Design an enzyme around this catalytic site. Structure first.
Site, short mmCIF file in Angstrom:
data_model
loop_
_atom_site.label_atom_id
_atom_site.label_comp_id
_atom_site.label_asym_id
_atom_site.label_seq_id
_atom_site.Cartn_x
_atom_site.Cartn_y
_atom_site.Cartn_z
N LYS A 1 0.80 -1.22 0.00
CA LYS A 1 0.00 0.00 0.00
C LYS A 1 0.85 1.28 0.00
O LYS A 1 1.82 1.39 0.73
CB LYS A 1 -0.99 0.02 1.19
CG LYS A 1 -2.40 0.41 0.81
CD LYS A 1 -3.32 0.60 2.02
CE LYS A 1 -3.47 -0.64 2.88
NZ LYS A 1 -4.56 -1.58 2.43
N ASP B 1 1.01 2.81 5.23
CA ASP B 1 0.91 2.24 6.57
C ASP B 1 0.30 0.78 6.73
O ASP B 1 -0.38 0.52 7.71
CB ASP B 1 0.08 3.22 7.43
CG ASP B 1 -1.40 3.20 7.12
OD1 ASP B 1 -1.77 2.73 6.01
OD2 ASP B 1 -2.19 3.60 8.00
N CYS B 2 0.55 -0.14 5.81
CA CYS B 2 -0.05 -1.45 5.99
C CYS B 2 0.81 -2.34 6.90
O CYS B 2 1.97 -2.63 6.57
CB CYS B 2 -0.34 -1.88 4.59
SG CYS B 2 -1.61 -3.14 4.47
N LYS C 1 -6.43 3.24 -8.21
CA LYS C 1 -5.80 2.02 -8.69
C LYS C 1 -5.43 2.04 -10.16
O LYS C 1 -6.29 2.21 -11.02
CB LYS C 1 -6.68 0.81 -8.39
CG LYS C 1 -6.85 0.57 -6.92
CD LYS C 1 -7.48 -0.80 -6.65
CE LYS C 1 -8.90 -0.76 -6.18
NZ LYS C 1 -9.03 -0.15 -4.83
N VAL D 1 -4.23 -6.06 -1.16
CA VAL D 1 -2.87 -5.66 -0.87
C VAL D 1 -2.57 -6.01 0.62
O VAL D 1 -3.40 -5.78 1.52
CB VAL D 1 -2.61 -4.18 -1.27
CG1 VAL D 1 -2.73 -3.22 -0.10
CG2 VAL D 1 -1.26 -4.03 -1.94
N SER E 1 -1.25 -11.92 4.11
CA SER E 1 0.04 -11.87 4.79
C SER E 1 0.39 -13.17 5.50
O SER E 1 1.56 -13.56 5.45
CB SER E 1 0.11 -10.69 5.75
OG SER E 1 -0.83 -10.78 6.81
N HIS F 1 2.12 0.61 14.97
CA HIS F 1 0.90 1.38 14.70
C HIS F 1 0.32 1.87 16.05
O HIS F 1 0.01 3.05 16.21
CB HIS F 1 -0.12 0.53 13.93
CG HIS F 1 0.10 0.58 12.45
ND1 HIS F 1 -0.79 1.23 11.61
CD2 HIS F 1 1.15 0.12 11.71
CE1 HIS F 1 -0.26 1.14 10.40
NE2 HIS F 1 0.90 0.48 10.40
#
Lengths: 211, 212
Positions: free
Chosen positions: A8, A19-20, A47, A60, A74, A160
């Site tokens: 991202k 910030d992913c 996109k 993503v 992930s 985060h």
């Protein structure tokens, strides 16, 4: 044939890393395994066609291990990386695979909390207290003296927590949680964290609309 | 439906580092000794934030919340409320010894601030240290025997200030002949809770320096 990752980007900044925590866990895995990869960035508010070709559902992170076949999630990506590039090993013993599992969802609730008496602060603190007891008894990292997969998953989450809670709530992980502070300091100062983290600016910018 | 929290003094210019307040340290020692899950919220008093200004409008530390939303001031009050809400493990000090060493902290500040050696501030501090040695020799190693109690958590941090500041500014020591005071000081300052909450010497010295 070349390993590629798509992560991202910041909203309105297709050239700025976003910030992913999930994408960053994937990036931390490739950095720790010392894999050479191409890092693509995507602004989901605009996109581009190349992104829609490789991620038809707009997911993503996506990962290409060098076979032209993109895969999402992930948990799936990191475990495929562990399977395909097993050394250096990052395996976490199943025994500790769920340490800190409730910290991220607890954080989001307290960040979003508009009520100072819904028990959300107390809940996050109890989760952080458990993490501290674990780290106190079991090496600096979740699995002793060496970094493993759980650290690469938890790290971005705690990062985060640290940046968003300080900015939005003026809340910090209390210094009496010495084990979490030793962990945080060591994890974030690793070359892998320094090269994959977002800037505080874009971590805060990424959460601001959700608050 | 609230966490056990305490607002304590942070180091000057270092909001993530604990400072030199002996009263905040007393509360911190109490929370550590009781093994209560808590959060210590650091406050740089030279840069007071609005979240602190709300909870404690008179800008004073320490201030405590046991989980009910009621912010309580004064370490004497705070440690006693902690004792009531969390009686186990007990830190009750017998009333017989609850005031042991109560005059030492003000006699230390009086002597430290003193420029005149004929004041009596030095002798008064000595008699109290001498009195403490006798009580500790008869009822030691702590103010109430073999285990720590509330009085040790109040006196401990105050004795640490006396030890560091009087040495720094005057080359003054708690006389070595006070073997029990020294055994008590060695024991208290080496406990996990003390090692953890013990301020860095510079914070304590830089705090007294303007007052000296």
């Amino acid at each position: 044939m070349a390993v590629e990752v798509c992560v991202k980007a910041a909203v309105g900044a297709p050239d700025i890393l976003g910030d992913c925590p999930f994408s960053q866990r994937v990036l931390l895995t490739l950095e720790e395994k010392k894999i050479t990869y191409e890092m693509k960035l995507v602004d989901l508010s605009n996109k581009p066609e190349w992104f829609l070709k490789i991620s038809p559902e707009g997911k993503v992170p996506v990962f290409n291990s060098g076979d032209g076949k993109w895969i999402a999630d992930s948990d799936v990506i990191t475990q495929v990386i562990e399977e395909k590039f097993p050394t250096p090993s990052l395996v976490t013993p199943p025994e500790y695979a769920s340490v800190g599992s409730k910290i991220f969802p607890s954080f989001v609730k307290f960040l979003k909390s508009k009520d100072a008496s819904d028990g959300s602060e107390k809940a996050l603190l109890d989760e952080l207290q458990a993490l501290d007891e674990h780290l106190k008894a079991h090496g600096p990292y979740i699995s002793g003296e060496n970094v493993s997969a759980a650290d690469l998953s938890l790290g971005p989450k705690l990062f985060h927590l640290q940046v968003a809670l300080e900015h939005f709530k003026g809340w910090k992980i209390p210094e009496n949680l010495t084990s979490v502070h030793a962990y945080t300091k060591a994890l974030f100062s690793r070359e892998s964290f320094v090269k994959t983290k977002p800037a505080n600016q874009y971590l805060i910018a990424g959460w601001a609309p959700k608050v």
